[PDB]
């Protein structure tokens, strides 16, 4: 009742990805609808209090990228293109042998990265207080490029501005030395020049050193985390607003919750060491975004006077101001594709915070023994017109010899993905 | 009378590159033709013995690759394509303000790689005993890929052959122990299996190491070098047949005369140190081509008998045998494009030894104050169709900070290319 | 904030444990799966809307906390209360 389709097709500005997997669906809740709550699991904490139902149904999930792209096709995508986005979806369920939208919470149970692996359909549930085709609604191209210019350096280095700034407030040492001097803004001092656009929003994070002896000798995982309280419960801020993971040339530090962390193959569920899980740093967005672990800036806290000094406090979190530009968080081969926008009166910049394409009408849930599944998404591409003379940074596999070739099986037949892979390699002007 | 064209169009299966340069043409030999030979310069050896004329004529030579490609356009080419070859040619000479074919010998005087350089025309000359368009005669695609298999490993690892090989010629220790024993060629021994095809020819070189202490303490530059003799004159064999530069894992060794070597920007004429030059290697073709510094193989030199052991000897040079396969020499950003095949009653595999496309009717010579040159070549591409699962090796820029940008200009305005760049990154099956 | 499926684990991790405890010079980083057992720490795509404190988040509550310093061997991680928060990309809100 069906054939085996797995491949990719690169034609012009579009890509056709075809993934076919084998599934196995057990009977869940034994054909019943059971109630579940924190108290059923003991309900230790206030923040973890929950209530809802669990249903016997299973569902097919293909939200992650590595489902639809082989590691070579992903390289072919990211090195040659400045943007991509899905167009059309096609689903087929065949060779069978015997609502709340939960797909956008980065859950497990999606089709395996490797086509020869057979997977178990996840169990559906929700919380409270055969073939078909699908059409993706219009979304902006994900920006798979890193800016080659920074927000503050957009100026011409060779020419002064005609604007003037206040250089000196006194003549020198003594009493009653007050004066007002105005230098012109020039390349000699680029800090003081007037600018049209300012960096994006920030909600600050605590920086954790990957060298543990430099960290504080106390438990600050929760007590020192950034959080947002909704209806009396405090929720952790994860991953949060898109901000650079660290300053230029700092490899050791990472924001506490400010990243997406993937586990490596075979990684344990609880208390695994730092080597076990792959943390991702969005440092390509440093050019237009404040660092997650740094303050946005300073503001004056008072009126200066004869007997009072000018005073400035730190701005820990900054909202939106007119004149801001920013980059959205990057998408990964292991990352989610889309997220459903919550139906609400209003929202700002609906793009989801874990990355991917926010959609008001995302691909619908498929609710559902063994069989086959073939999913086909049509992707649209954006080529680079760049005039850059010197060669780009490309995603490359290391040439040096190793025991196991990357993105392949080991001796025991286990597929692995050795590192997190971002989409931002090619560059653009700012 | 003309415009300036410096951009490239990547359209479908074709590349159209258009270069434009500013030049200067002096008067050579004060409008005179002059006989020249070695007897004027002293000509110490018959190897250097030459006879020819020098003409006041100049000529424009665009033959090298970096004339027609930028470092980014070269990267865009070599990462994405399995082959290329030129199709059409366009030459224009304008904004004027006041035969022996020499273009296949890798001479200097070609249009500069960086468009803001003004280049001086080389004087025409030969030895012996306005616009136009051109059509490249059909040549095979250059193979810009490296094999993902080796010639001897083509076999299926899981299955025995139905051929037999002679395992034992004796039973064991003693007199009159002779026997004939035959075993099945199979996975456990891959060396003795029968194979349909054998590696390309070899003409031996001498091995030199970049670490000087491992080299012999004697002068062997000319004495220990391979050569071919023609009518009493010994020509150094350069670069010679296409062979792998070194065995797997030895990067410090290179063939004496066997590689193409380039100078770094600012490198003197004579006796520069090894850090001033950019040696190139053919390690990509190691799978089907014999190492340049290794013997081709062994042969039987005798007949064995009750009184005579089996004797062997090393094959230092092997010509063509039926069944051989070989890779041509790679092309580089700085290397030559075409040569003219010498007009003769016969030739074998005319592809030139320094790399590029052999042509019986190459782009014709342009014989010719100051002005502008604009040259335009059309290129045909062979796309990469492979099903390889894991990611390729790509040519990439380096992530780290540095004083100067590679393939750009320094503080004094000098433009340099840090390293040689080959065309072979993507892979194919053997 | 409850939009998750309570029956499944995420493939994402959080930093659960920084020190072994009850000792001197005990320091580590332990990572755990984000899952139904602890639902406060899971990564979410949308955060509540703006707030301006009064005597969607509650009008009498602080929006949340932030890090006000850099921790170090000699410095404990400090927080501060966000009394008002302007728009951030990713916020959703209901009007009145």
């Amino acid at each position, epitope marked *: 009742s069906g054939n085996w389709h797995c491949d990719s097709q690169w034609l012009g500005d579009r890509v056709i990805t075809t993934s076919t997997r084998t599934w196995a669906l057990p009977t869940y809740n034994n054909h019943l609808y059971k109630q579940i709550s924190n108290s059923t699991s003991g309900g230790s904490s206030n923040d973890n209090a929950y209530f809802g139902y669990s249903t016997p149904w299973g569902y097919f999930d293909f939200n992650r990228f590595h489902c639809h792209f082989s590691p070579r096709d992903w390289q072919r995508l990211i090195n040659n293109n400045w943007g991509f986005r899905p167009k059309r979806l096609n689903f087929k369920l065949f060779n069978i042998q015997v609502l709340p939208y939960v797909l956008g919470s980065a859950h497990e149970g999606c089709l395996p990265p490797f086509p020869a692996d057979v997977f178990m359909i996840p169990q559906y549930g929700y919380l409270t207080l055969f073939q078909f085709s699908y059409e993706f609604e219009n979304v902006p191209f994900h920006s798979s490029y890193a800016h080659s210019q920074s927000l503050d350096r957009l100026m011409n280095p060779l020419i002064d501005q005609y604007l003037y700034y206040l250089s000196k407030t006194i003549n020198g040492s003594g009493q009653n030395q007050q004066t007002l001097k105005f230098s012109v803004a020039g390349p000699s001092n680029m800090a003081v020049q007037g600018r049209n656009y300012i960096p994006g929003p920030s909600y600050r994070q605590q920086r954790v050193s990957t060298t543990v002896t430099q960290n504080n000798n106390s438990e600050f995982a929760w007590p020192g985390a950034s959080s947002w309280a909704l209806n009396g419960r405090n929720s952790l801020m994860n991953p949060g607003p898109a901000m650079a993971s660290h300053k230029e040339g700092e490899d*050791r530090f990472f924001p506490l919750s400010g990243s997406l962390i993937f586990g490596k193959q075979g990684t344990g569920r609880d208390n695994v060491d730092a*080597d076990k899980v792959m943390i991702t740093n969005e440092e390509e967005i440093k050019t237009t975004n404040p660092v997650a672990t740094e303050s946005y800036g300073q503001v004056a806290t008072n009126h200066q006077s004869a007997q009072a000094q000018a005073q400035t406090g730190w701005v820990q979190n900054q909202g939106i101001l007119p004149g801001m530009v920013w980059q959205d968080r990057d998408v990964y081969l292991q990352g989610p594709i889309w997220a459903k926008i919550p139906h609400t009166d209003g929202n700002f910049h609906p793009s989801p915070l874990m990355g991917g394409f926010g959609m008001k009408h995302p691909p619908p849930q498929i609710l559902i023994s063994t069989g086959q599944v073939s999913v086909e998404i049509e992707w649209e591409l954006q080529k680079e017109n760049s005039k850059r003379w010197n060669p780009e940074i490309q995603y490359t596999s*290391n040439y040096y010899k190793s025991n196991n070739v990357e993105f392949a099986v080991n001796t025991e037949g286990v597929y692995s993905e050795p590192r997190p892979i971002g989409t931002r390699y090619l560059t653009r002007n700012l | 009378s003309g415009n300036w064209h410096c951009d490239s169009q990547w359209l479908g299966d074709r590349v159209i590159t258009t270069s434009t340069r500013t030049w200067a043409l002096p008067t050579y030999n004060n409008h005179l033709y002059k006989q020249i030979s070695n007897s004027t310069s002293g000509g110490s050896s018959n190897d250097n013995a030459y006879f020819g004329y020098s003409t006041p004529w100049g000529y424009f030579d665009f033959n090298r690759f970096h004339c027609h490609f930028s470092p980014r356009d070269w990267q865009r080419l070599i990462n994405n394509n399995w082959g290329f070859r030129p199709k059409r040619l366009n030459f224009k000479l304008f904004n004027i303000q006041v035969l022996p074919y020499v273009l296949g010998s890798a001479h200097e005087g070609c249009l500069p790689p960086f468009p803001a350089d003004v280049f001086m025309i080389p004087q025409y000359g030969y030895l012996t005993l306005f616009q136009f368009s051109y059509e490249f005669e059909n040549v095979p695609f250059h193979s810009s890929y490296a094999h993902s298999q080796s010639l001897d490993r083509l076999m299926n690892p899981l299955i025995d052959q139905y051929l037999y090989y002679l395992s034992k010629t004796i039973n064991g220790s003693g007199q009159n122990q002779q026997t004939l024993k035959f075993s099945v060629a199979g996975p456990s021994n891959m060396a003795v299996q029968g194979r349909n095809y054998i590696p390309g020819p070899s003409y031996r070189q001498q091995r030199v190491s970049t670490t000087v202490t491992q080299n012999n303490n004697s002068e062997f530059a000319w004495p220990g070098a391979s050569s071919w003799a023609l009518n009493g004159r010994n020509s150094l064999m350069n670069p010679g047949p296409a062979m792998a530069s070194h065995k797997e894992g030895e990067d410090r060794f290179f063939p004496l005369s066997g590689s193409l070597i380039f100078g770094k920007q600012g490198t003197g004429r004579d006796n520069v140190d090894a850090d001033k030059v950019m040696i190139t290697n053919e390690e990509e073709i190691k799978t089907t081509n014999p190492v340049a510094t290794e013997s081709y193989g062994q042969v039987a030199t005798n007949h064995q008998s009750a009184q005579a052991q089996a004797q062997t000897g090393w094959v230092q040079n092997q010509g063509i045998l039926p069944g051989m396969v070989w890779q041509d020499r790679d092309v580089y950003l700085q290397g030559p494009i075409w040569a003219k095949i010498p007009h003769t009653d016969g030739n074998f595999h005319p592809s030139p030894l320094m790399g590029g496309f052999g042509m019986k009717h190459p782009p014709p010579q342009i014989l010719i104050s100051t002005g502008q040159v604009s040259v335009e070549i059309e290129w045909e591409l062979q796309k990469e169709n492979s099903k390889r699962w894991n990611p390729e090796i790509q040519y990439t820029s380096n992530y780290y900070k540095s004083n100067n940008v590679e393939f750009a200009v320094n503080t004094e305005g000098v433009y340099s290319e840090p390293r040689p760049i080959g065309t072979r990154y993507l892979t194919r099956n053997l | 904030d409850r939009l998750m499926n309570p029956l499944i684990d995420q493939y994402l991790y959080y930093l659960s444990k920084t020190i072994n405890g009850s000792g001197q010079n005990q320091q580590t980083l332990k990572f755990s799966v984000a899952g139904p057992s602890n639902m406060a720490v899971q990564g979410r795509n949308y955060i509540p809307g703006p707030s301006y404190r009064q005597q969607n988040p509650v009008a009498t509550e602080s929006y949340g906390q932030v890090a006000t310093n850099h921790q170090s061997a000699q410095a404990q991680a400090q927080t501060g209360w966000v009394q008002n928060q302007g728009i951030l990309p990713g916020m959703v809100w209901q009007d009145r």
Partner: antibody, heavy 127, light 104 residues
Framework: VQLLESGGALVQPGGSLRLSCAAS????????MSWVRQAPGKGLEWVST????????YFADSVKGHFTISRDNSKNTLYLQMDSLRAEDTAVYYC?????????????????????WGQGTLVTVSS | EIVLTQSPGTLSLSPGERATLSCRAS???????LAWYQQKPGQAPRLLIY???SRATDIPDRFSGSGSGTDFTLTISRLEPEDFAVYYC????????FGGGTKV
């Protein structure tokens, strides 16, 4: 992988010298690099580590303030400068390599076992 | 910091015999990774084990080690003439540190 050390020479106490490790056979910018010393009377002792990008450098307390480690990715060489040497600094200084590959995607988790070992140069501080 | 102490001092080998050795580390906060090195005199060292239980790339199956917490061991069998030498246990959980070494 070939690690080579230069600049190891006798130096009187209170005098400095600069060791350099020229490496090849690996990418070298994607890997952290360490220095580890062996005094003729003792065994192996670790001195300092520098990350692949050079962002993080840490030292031993024995060598602290006399030593600095830097690297130049462009030139493929690892530098260790020893200033105001004492007599207790005499050893063979071995150039060692980190197993872990480094990209701008991902971080530096710290030091690990030493994959490969050059032929250590020998510095003697005596008068 | 972390202090490492090799428990056995020394013994000399005639080929064919076998013996094991260990080291104890003060505090021993992280035990997943520890490395054993074997040094031949007059030349650069060479690696053996990497991680608490993982054998090296060019090292024979007979080389092995195990441990967690404060105590760790190096357990080797089928022990042949080339193997009489010094054994170095490195705790790299913190800044790298070596034990004094055990020369078997």
């Amino acid at each position: 992988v070939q690690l080579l050390e230069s600049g190891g020479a006798l130096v009187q106490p209170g005098g400095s010298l600069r060791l350099s490790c020229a490496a090849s056979g690996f990418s070298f910018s994607n890997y952290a690099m360490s220095w580890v010393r062996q005094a003729p009377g003792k065994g192996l002792e670790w001195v300092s580590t520098i990350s692949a990008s050079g962002g993080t450098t840490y030292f031993a307390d024995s060598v602290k303030g006399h030593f600095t480690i830097s690297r130049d990715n462009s030139k493929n060489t690892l530098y260790l400068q020893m200033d105001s040497l004492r007599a207790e600094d005499t050893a063979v200084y071995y150039c060692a390599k980190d197993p872990n590959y480094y990209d701008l995607s991902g971080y530096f988790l710290g030091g690990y076992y030493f994959d490969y070992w050059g032929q250590g140069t020998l510095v003697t501080v005596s008068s | 910091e972390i202090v490492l102490t090799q428990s056995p001092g020394t013994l000399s080998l005639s080929p064919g015999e076998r013996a094991t050795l260990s080291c104890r580390a003060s505090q021993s906060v992280r035990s997943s990774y520890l490395a054993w090195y074997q040094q031949k005199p007059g030349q650069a060292p060479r690696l053996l084990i990497y991680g608490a239980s993982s054998r090296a790339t060019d090292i024979p199956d007979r080389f092995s080690g195990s441990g967690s917490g404060t105590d760790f061991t190096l357990t080797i069998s089928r022990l042949e003439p080339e193997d009489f030498a010094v054994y170095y246990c490195q705790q790299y959980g913190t800044s790298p540190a070596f034990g004094g070494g055990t020369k078997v």
